[PDB]
Structure to design on (678 residues):
DNA sequence: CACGTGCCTGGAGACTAGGGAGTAATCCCCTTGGCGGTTAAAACGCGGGGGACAGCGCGTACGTGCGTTTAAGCGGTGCTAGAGCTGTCTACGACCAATTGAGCGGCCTCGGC
DNA sequence: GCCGAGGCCGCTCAATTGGTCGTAGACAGCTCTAGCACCGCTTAAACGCACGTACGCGCTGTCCCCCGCGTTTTAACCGCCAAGGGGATTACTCCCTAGTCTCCAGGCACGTG
């Protein structure tokens, strides 16, 4: 009835650490963290779209939001991962 | 660390001055208690730093006052 | 019938993120590379938090992440603490 | 049913345990009243914002989301009580 | 202003060199940066003075600045 | 170029804040603090310049960068 | 070309202090102050309609934004003035 | 007539209305929202200008300069918390 | 708490139809660079006295233990206020076309600092 | 005394007033969840008092290291000129995304070793 990132967080866990599990409360906390980060990036992207009078939200807006809301090394690695994903999606 | 029922009474007393005939959820009181305990523990950490600065071990109200001054709280 | 998450190489749902960006009234239009960029940044962030939490749990000779272990991941890495500020985790 | 003098429900051992968890080794006898005052100011801010949110939604009950949003306005993100 | 303009402009350019090569700066940008920087340093020095007075002193040392920054939250 | 923020400039800034006597080791720490502050602000400003496809840093970029830090600045194009 | 709050601020100034004038830079600072407050009270009124699935910014949203942005006594006086203005507008 | 005379306000209701429409804040703006920002954006201007004029009187001047506005912001407990750490050019 | 099975609501493919963003050309401002003079500020050395820091002794006030007293936590019962959801209708706000005066740039003129 | 604040004047891009349309919000009803009030017993935490010694704090002395001053050095700053990148605006063609319907499997709950 309610949409949560439980399956995907479980998959990411199974990739980073194959021998550790998650309690239900830990899944709730991780879901809250993901929603908070998503809201923080979406609101910033909306503000940048509104300030520049841009009707649409593109990958460049999200890249700037990432570089503005995350600290340094996290921002660099996130930008690298996002550009990799966008290139792999456009090419294929 | 804080007893649940006295904290509930204190929260209701404070809320009375803002809107009368007000009701609470248990989750609300639990959230307020968690936040208050975390805030006080952080304040005591900064107070201990201020006390260590002045070459003593016993924390005193002036340490709290200085920590809240630097923090920007009024 | 290949999903947009499979075209990019992600586990997070690109389509769900796009639908969240479209019904949240962030901008009247949303591009094709914005759903694929958040779905990668969020995946990287979840992987980082899960890796640190799993390390904390493994150091405590446990094999199942519990809410206290997340509060030790975010309160040892300076970047996560600067990203979330004063973060208090329930049952931690 | 007037409520008064409930600030003394934050007993001396409670403040003392909070200070111990924060690393304090010695506590002067004047810390307690200051702790009551500081806690009262913090609670007043949070409860004011929470009641504002409650009265926005046309409700007579303060819910967990109201307190969570009030704390988030203060840069004190809280997880585990919903979202 | 308490800082000379040319050294501050050179410092700003030197710092910005590490984020992107071949930047140009407007005069208004350097002026705003200088104003903000001076205000920040004055506030930091006020807090440092309170810290120094707390330790029964009139001469400020780096430990005072470190304590002020740590309570503020800038250094962690 | 950090040495351009000289000893008397730091001393004048301290006197503006009310400091009566300044130790000899304050200057290096002040220079480090100033470098950190400028690094943060200029990082945000350069991000904003990148968003606009520009090669010049404008006053509005610095104003927005300082607003992200709770350092609201008035009189430079608000 | 550039719309500014210049006549209005002067009119308000010649109501509280009829004998004190004001400089152009003070116009700049007051216009910036009014803009900052306006975007604060508009951003916090849009976030109180989005997080309620309500497509309208009514006077109730503006009142909640006023009570959430301004400090205590300032907020009380502001809500009093706004309620007075809305009552006068609806009546006449 | 005008929408500011109905509310007895000195600030533009219509200009605020379009600023709150064309800014894509929400799809629909109410009729009482622009007459509530205008009445709040005028009390705040009145308070700041009153404090600035008081500062100008204390300095034996007939004009409000940026320095007076900075003094008014710093002395008022409430206005300092609303704006945070505000640096005013030529202050 | 993993793991298996049925279901149903939302993501995907294909298509067509407007309108926003990419992209090329132009104008003319603002930034960057160089140079020479003056001159205000920075740098260096020095003498001294103000203050930082260590040591020491006193007596105040904290911490720990022990016996007593308070009231908090728990578990049941009872009742009603009001949260959440659904349905229906009237009223309010977006749109668009005509009307008309408030507000913005330019000027000239004139008194506070 | 004179240069930045004040009043006057012409001119375009709003704000208003008036209608019409569709749908969002106010309002009435009803169903069940959960928040408040109460009671009784248990017992853990708070409280008051006493005693000892840990350490805050005032005083004294010594060395060192900032501060004010005088002199020499240096590079900030003002003024001027040149030259040219790139910020700001506009005109066009084309590719991206919103809205729709058909097709079907990923992802929510629920029962399981």
């Amino acid at each position: 009835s309610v949409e949560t990132y439980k399956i995907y967080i479980f998959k990411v866990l199974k990739q980073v650490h194959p021998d550790i599990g998650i309690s239900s409360k830990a899944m709730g906390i991780m879901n809250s963290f993901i929603n908070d980060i998503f809201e923080k990036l979406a609101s910033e992207s909306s503000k940048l779209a509104r300030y520049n009078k841009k009707p649409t939200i593109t990958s460049r807006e999200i890249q700037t939001a990432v570089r503005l809301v995350l600290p340094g090394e996290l921002a660099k690695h996130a930008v690298s991962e996002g550009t990799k994903a966008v290139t792999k999606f456009t090419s294929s | 660390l804080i007893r649940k029922l006295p904290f509930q009474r204190l929260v209701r007393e404070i809320a009375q001055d803002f809107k009368t005939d007000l009701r609470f959820q248990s989750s609300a009181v639990a959230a307020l208690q968690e936040a208050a305990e975390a805030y006080l523990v952080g304040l005591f950490e900064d107070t201990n730093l201020c006390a260590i600065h002045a070459k003593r071990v016993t924390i005193m109200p002036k340490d709290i006052q200085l920590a809240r001054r630097i923090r920007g709280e009024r | 019938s290949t999903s947009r998450s499979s075209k990019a190489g992600l586990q997070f749902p690109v389509g769900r993120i796009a639908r969240f960006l479209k019904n949240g009234k962030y901008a009247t239009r949303v591009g094709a590379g914005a759903p694929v960029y958040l779905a990668a940044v969020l995946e990287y962030l979840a992987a980082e938090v899960l890796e640190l939490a799993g390390n904390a749990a493994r150091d405590n000779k446990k094999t199942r992440i519990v809410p206290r272990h997340i509060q030790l991941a975010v309160r040892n890495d300076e970047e996560l603490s600067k990203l979330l500020g004063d973060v208090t985790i329930a049952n931690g | 049913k007037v409520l008064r003098d409930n600030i003394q429900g934050i007993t001396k051992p409670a403040i003392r345990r909070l200070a111990r968890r924060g690393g304090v080794k010695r506590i002067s006898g004047l810390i307690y009243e200051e702790t009551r005052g500081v806690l009262k100011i913090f609670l007043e801010n949070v409860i004011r914002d929470a009641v504002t949110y409650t009265e926005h939604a046309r409700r007579k009950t303060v819910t967990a989301m109201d307190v969570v949003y009030a704390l988030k306005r203060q840069g004190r993100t809280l997880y585990g009580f919903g979202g």
Notes: Chain H touches chain G through 57 residues (CB under 8 Å). The first strand of chain H starts at residue 28 and ends at 29. Residues 1-3, 12-15, 17-18, 28, 63 of chain H lie near DNA strand J (CB under 10 Å from a C1'). The CA atoms of residues 1 and 88 of chain H lie 38 Å apart.
